[model samples]
Target chain A: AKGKLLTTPTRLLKLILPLPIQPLALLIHPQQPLSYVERLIQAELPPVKIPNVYFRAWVRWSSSTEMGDFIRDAARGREFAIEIEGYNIEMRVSVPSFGDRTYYMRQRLRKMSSEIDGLAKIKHECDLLAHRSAHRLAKGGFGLLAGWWGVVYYVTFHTEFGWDLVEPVTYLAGLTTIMGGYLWFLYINRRQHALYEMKGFDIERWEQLVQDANALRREIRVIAVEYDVDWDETRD
Target chain B: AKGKLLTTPTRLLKLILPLPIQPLALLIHPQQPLSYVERLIQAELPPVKIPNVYFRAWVRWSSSTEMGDFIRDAARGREFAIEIEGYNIEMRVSVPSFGDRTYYMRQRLRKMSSEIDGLAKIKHECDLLAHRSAHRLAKGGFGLLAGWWGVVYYVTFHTEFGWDLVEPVTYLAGLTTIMGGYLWFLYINRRQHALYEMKGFDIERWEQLVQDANALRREIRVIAVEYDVDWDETRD
Candidate 1:
């Protein structure tokens, strides 16, 4: 039900725009309550969290369809063929449906757990790298910013008695280079932090735990049909 | 029920006798049908297979409380703290029951899948080794058997013009060595083949597949309690 719509015009719009816009659009779209069956299914099943990037600086909320494939696959019985970032892992899980959603669901969950585990390991390693890089970038950026700020202050507000016109021009070239380095570090660190947050291992682990519970719950519902038991009525 | 009942006399007999006797004794000790609730629970639940080794040569059938700890843990709701064979892999699955059999059942199924997968891989590797060793043993056994047979035939039924009395004793010494080698190979190969049979990967895979199916079935039954659907009366 979640993945039953995707027109050519929509795909064209999605393809042309930047990545985070699509989910933002969906978020603002008309919200609807789930049907009785959907609610029943969702009660036991884990809620699929579409990851949102919060811009703390300007109060912005954004999500992408990058990791949403895994979510859709679990909820809507789609196949998994994902490639992990910075790893030589090509996960191609193609469990034959045979007209059975439960069969595929079981296979998908197993694949997802293994995939998530592998992905988490890689994410952790990358996060460590990103963390180190971010630290270095921030350090370097602040160091360059300090150097440029000092140079600018000296040139503009030098009240020293013997201030030479030549001194200001000489340091002006060095000031621009320092300023450029600072800007570069700021941009790079932002990207690194973003990647680190997106691929956080804890997030992966939590998602896996929730998914495991949900998949098992759905599987239980499917099996419950064999006996003269109606969980809805029984509960009511 | 299989896990209960260990009287003083039974414990004494079990302690005095060898290991295989216990499971064998239990096997013959009348099995009673499960109750309505038990049947309902078991309907979707996978049947647990306790491994037993049957010997034809010396006539032996053996099982242990060693791996049976895993089975008993689930049925009795004990924690899983197992270390698999030939690896430092310690399986520690502690699914908090919270009076929910289905919750634990789900956890048990997942833990079993991974454990079975790991066990199967190790079994396959060991099986290959066993297969290779079995091949070598059979080859060497027949070779020595042939050599011993030739010497025995020559010494015992030699058609020399005059029988050398000393010649038979000289060949007999050599015959014993060759015979000993052959017998040792036979014994070793038989045991290897038996181990190979017991830990077959196919058997593990088949068991896992069955359990997976049954688990899903049982899971469905549990959740069916929430829906107004009676599986017994709603058969297609």
Candidate 2:
């Protein structure tokens, strides 16, 4: 196969060939390779952020590789392909040189650490809501219900004489006032805190993320050793 | 407190009193008590189904009682208040008579069993996708990309003589065909197997449901024992 294939005649063929099948070519893609390659030229890569409140995001709001492909790709370095707020951002060790091998390792540690911390942050928040709900149910909820019950009982029987008859127009006045306040509190908390609509307090996904993070961390450790980097002393 | 309070004179006050405070009353509610009580005569209660494909579902598409509230309510029997497709259908055991304690126990086993099985079914589906995607990446993906690369090398250099360019109108035809196929594949799988978007593979939630189911099963055992029902032989 010499340069002769791309002669004047073949040049015309080259231009016309892929052009016709562009539709089919466009249909199937190796997204992983593209994302991985894109990471190399991207000037300031955005830090990863996995989205939550996906219901809002969704109502608001690809993945596969082969073995030899992975092996060849890993020959460079495996992209951190886990789903994140920032999409698949594979890498070419952002540092200037291969001489700075540990640099990539440390960043991997940092991202994995950040991810687990974020997971914990999410879980902690849900826990706090559960706790607050429990506390309120015990304190505020009971107090409100009990308080209402007490008023009902005392006004009915405790006093020597109870409330007296009121004016005919008073019914409309009372209904109007009460309806206004009722509407006020109704909209209060439905919008207070948002969560993943599909699974409220997604303990399941939380654990999946943590496990993936830990596995990624272990992966970095192995890579650090491969590159003779000091991952043991690294501050993640 | 007298029947005299509801007499013609006091009746006027009674009618108008709650009207003014309706707003605040509407604002604060014991939804738990409401759902629980609503269960008493809901006639035909629905079976539960936790939604998945929440990204799609979200795009497409309460809580605690105090100890006394719980205690008094549990005196009736604690309602099944887990987050579910059907929200907070707490209960009065759904039996016509207290003699049918086993009836409630079996239904719970049925529901809890149904829940864990549903969770497994979901996990299995996600696993299947992961498996198919893996297979495709290995087989179809590598085959496609490698086939294209081969075509590039062969057509460019392998042939004895190559074809020449076609007419100018062909460019638009080629572009249109490729564009159509690209658009087709793009929309294909995204709408295919739906999933809980928040956490793609919700292993943690799966585990949570299983644990909840097991605990519920054990509790049913205790109730079965209390009622002298044969939980040991229960199919669920």
Interface root mean square deviation for model 1, in Å? Answer: 42.8
What clash count goes with each model?
15, 15
Distance (Å) between predicted and true CA of A183, model 2?
4.9
Candidate 1 has a DockQ of 0.00
Where does model 2 exceed 4 Å of error? A1-109, A115-141, A158-180, A183-236, B1-236
C-alpha lDDT (0 to 100) for residue B7 of candidate 2:
12
Compared with the true structure, what per-residue lDDT tens digits does model 1 show for residues A1-236? Answer: 01121212111111111111242112211122112212333343334442211111111111121222212222224433322222334333332222243443445566666677776678678867756776666556556545544554454356452234534564686588789879999988657557757755456566767678566745545433321122331132
Among incorrect, acceptable, medium and high, the docking class of model 2 is: incorrect
lDDT of 2 at B219: 67
